[PDB]
């Protein structure tokens, strides 16, 4: 019994962490797009 519940809870955590890692990747990509926007402001100013 407790080892079965613990397996189930481990599966739960693994699914959550996989999902969390996808959230992080989305924020990382948002950051790349923000860097491109600031580069675009700099280029407009230097022209």
């Amino acid at each position: 019994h407790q080892s079965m519940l613990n397996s189930q809870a481990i599966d739960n955590l693994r699914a959550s962490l996989e999902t969390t890692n996808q959230a992080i990747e989305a924020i990382r990509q948002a950051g790349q797009e923000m860097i491109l926007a600031v580069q675009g402001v700099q280029d407009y100013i230097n022209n």
Binding site: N12, L13, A15, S16, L17, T19, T20, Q22, A23, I24, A26, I27, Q29, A30, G31, E33, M34, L36, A37, V38, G40, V41, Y44
Partner: protein, 35 residues
């Protein structure tokens, strides 16, 4: 006549969309954790 205008709205809009995608994924993770 179109005047020259600063428009970084594409990159800012892509960032806004990605931060919304992250919010939905965090909500899914937190759903899983509560359950």
């Amino acid at each position: 006549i179109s005047l020259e205008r600063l428009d970084v709205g594409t990159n800012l809009g892509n960032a806004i969309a990605k931060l919304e995608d992250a919010k939905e994924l965090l909500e899914s993770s937190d759903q899983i954790l509560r359950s």
